[PDB]
Amino acid sequence: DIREIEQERASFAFKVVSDIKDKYSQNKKVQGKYSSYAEKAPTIILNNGLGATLAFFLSKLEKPIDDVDYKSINPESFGNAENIAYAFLYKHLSTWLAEGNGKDSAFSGLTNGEDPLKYIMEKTAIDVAISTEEALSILNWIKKFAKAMLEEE
């Protein structure tokens, strides 16, 4: 049977927001900062592009570019709450744009072979526009779920 991509979007957004809520329930500041960053991220993507947003997420993480593999990021290994929220947001966005909701899921991921930052690095503008639409949609879902079930500030 077929599954609509919106269902995968909702499932991924709920999974990530519930995961951050459960892992850092005591950390009110982390939840508030993550909610603010999720609500502010789509505007940054629209104004400066998806690649600039992805790199700016890593700029606050203090990690360098060109070594950006999202699988090799431990988002809990950052002391600051802002760093934790930025790492969570970047990991969620990159995971969605690289693998979707899993291989078996309806959405297997757009890039599917490497990190979306590298995808934006060395691919044509039509593909980055498709990735920008996908990122905006998943960001809208994540923002909705965070504003609903995560504590604000």
């Binding site: 049977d1 991509i5 919106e6 309806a106 599917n112 039509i126 593909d127 498709i130 639409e133």
Partner: protein, 346 residues
Amino acid sequence: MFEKAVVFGLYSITPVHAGSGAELSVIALPIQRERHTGFPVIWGQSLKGVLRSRFRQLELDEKIEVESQKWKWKEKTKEVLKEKADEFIKKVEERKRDPLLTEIVFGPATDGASEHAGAVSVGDAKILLFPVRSAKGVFAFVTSPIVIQRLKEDFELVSEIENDIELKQILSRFKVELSNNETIAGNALILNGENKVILEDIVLKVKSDSNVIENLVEVLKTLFGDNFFGKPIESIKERIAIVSDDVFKSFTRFSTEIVARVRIDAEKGTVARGGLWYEEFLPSDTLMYSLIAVGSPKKENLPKEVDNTQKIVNVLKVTFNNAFLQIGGDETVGKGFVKVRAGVLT
């Protein structure tokens, strides 16, 4: 009782709203759909009403070319009616009766209902190609084996009417099956290095077969020539997708346009109280085909240029090929315009 059948391609250039007032629903004003399938449809009574209205206007304005010659209904009335012709034209001048060719083809006015019937039987406009947005490319023209089977079954009607053989042989090789997670689409929509296409919000694996789209494309050339309503047909072959029946049904149900119209109080400058209603529109660039069946003109005392059905057919083909109509009514807001391209089969 019917000797010739002429198809009627319809290509919407503006959103089309065929109103369906027989709906117990206040959410919006829906377009009529085939109840047992949900596909959008235009009833023949609506289609014939705009055909007859347009044809009557041309005859009144003396624009119809018959046998490559101009038609004068006033002069032909004297040749046809002689006595009482002056009395008859008074009714037409009073908008009580329709001109001769209009009454011959579509039928007489309401007052003269029992005098005779028309010569044509305007069929029902059914879906053939639906435009849905796609990730790669602006959009895609979508169909399904159920629509293809319906189209092939329609040629059997024409083949039996004209006692033809090659007509049923056109799609005799069409055996296309599609899983729910499969599709057959052109190269203008396939995502790079993935063999996937994303229509609306559905990811569909692309099947590896090119004959299905090729034979389908040339079928439209038989009915519509190479000029695909103002554009080369090969330019749009690359954006034609074949999806499963269930997936196509979802596109027909939900991808139709929904517009939130409103009215505003002039004095207050804001929306008037209770003045808010939403409508549903068929998307533009939607391809629908009808099937007009025409028999011998029932009314006698008729000129030689409209003697048989073959004579009648050439009148419809000439006056309607590459012509723009207004099906359904939202004319004052520029909705309903559709390109029409007729043409007999092989």
